[PDB]
Amino acid sequence: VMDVMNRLILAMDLMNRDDALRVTGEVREYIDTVKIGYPLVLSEGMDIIAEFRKRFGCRIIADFKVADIPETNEKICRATFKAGADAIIVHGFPGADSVRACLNVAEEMGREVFLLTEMSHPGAEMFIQGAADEIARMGVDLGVKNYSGPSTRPERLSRLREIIGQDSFLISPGVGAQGGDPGETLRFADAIIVGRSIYLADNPAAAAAGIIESIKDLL
């Protein structure tokens, strides 16, 4: 599995290149893995991935919530890996063919897929939560090794960990701003994802350091 420094992944959702680079640089001693999503990519271009690789020694997870038909999913994954992403996040709710399409491209291109199981926001209760255990089981059947699940619902995160097994790699957003606790989340997830609690802080480095101090016995 990827070796995530300090079990902490930065969700870099600032939408300005200068701010995104400044904040990421400030926390670089604490974090070697950065999740870049569409807020930044749609604002600054896929070349922002290149820029991060150039500036920082960071692994890049493209949080693109891939959620199209197989043919389109293939194209999205190809473009994303071509740009230098180490991994891509993919929805399971569009079904097994859509997921398989991403897995096939990742296998061919030597990169990784993370399957999102249940989302951490309130609206997730409406449809995704009821499908999440089956989505996780589907991932296991398809050979998915990497997953994302919700910090905001420890009971759900625990069940999802059970389904995917201890050997699977599990990351978890919703820590901090959305209400999730770093330590409790790391009972089940391999790494936590943190965005606003760090990138909106007056001192992002102090914020990251504070989170890390709070989980030091788990490192």
Ligand X SMILES: O=c1cnn([C@@H]2O[C@H](COP(=O)(O)O)[C@@H](O)[C@H]2O)c(=O)[nH]1
Distance (Å) of CA 9 to CA 4, 50, 175 = 7, 18, 11
65 in catalytic set: yes
**Residue 95 to residue 108: CA distance in whole angstroms:** 21
Q: Which residues of 107-145 are buried (b: 16+ CB within 10 A; e: fewer)?
A: eeeebbbbbbbbbbeeebeeebbeebbebbebbeeeebb
CB atoms within 10 A of CB 180: 24
13 annotated among ligand-binding-site residues: yes
32 annotated among ligand-binding-site residues: no
Structural tokens at position 179: 């209400």
Question: Across the chain, which distance is largest between two alpha carbons, in Å?
Answer: 45
Among residues 54, 65, 82, 145, the one annotated as catalytic is 65
Positions 89 through 148 that interact with ligand X (CB under 6 A): 119-121, 148
174 annotated among ligand-binding-site residues: yes
- In the list 70, 140, 178, 205, the residue contacting ligand X (rule: CB under 6 A) is 178
Report, in Å, the least distance between residue 174 CB and ligand X. 5
Report, in Å, the least distance between residue 18 CB and a copy of itself. 16
Q: Which is nearer to a copy of itself, 19 or 29 (CB)?
A: 19
Q: Is 11 in the site for ligand X (CB under 6 A)?
A: yes
Interacting partner of 194 out of ligand X, a copy of itself, none (Cβ under 5 to 8 A depending on kind): ligand X
Question: Do 102 and 65 meet the contact criterion of CB atoms below 8 Å apart?
Answer: no
39 annotated among ligand-binding-site residues: no
Question: Do 174 and 134 meet the contact criterion of CB atoms below 8 Å apart?
Answer: no
CA angle 149, 155, 160 (to 5 degrees): 40
**Residue 14 to residue 44: CA distance in whole angstroms:** 10
70 annotated among ligand-binding-site residues: yes
Binding window for a copy of itself (CB under 8 A); candidates: 20-28, 32-40, 183-191, 209-217: 32-40
- In the list 115, 191, 194, 211, the residue contacting ligand X (rule: CB under 6 A) is 194
**Residue 108 to residue 114: CA distance in whole angstroms:** 16
Interacting partner of 206 out of a copy of itself, ligand X, none (Cβ under 5 to 8 A depending on kind): none
Q: Is 128 in the site for a copy of itself (CB under 8 A)?
A: yes
Point out the residues that are catalytic. 65
Task: List interacting residues with ligand X (CB under 6 A).
Answer: 11, 13, 37, 63, 68-69, 72, 119-121, 148, 150, 173-178, 193-197
Task: List interacting residues with a copy of itself (CB under 8 A).
Answer: 13, 15, 37-39, 41-43, 45-46, 64-65, 67-70, 72, 75-76, 78-80, 83, 91-99, 119-128, 131, 134-135, 138, 178
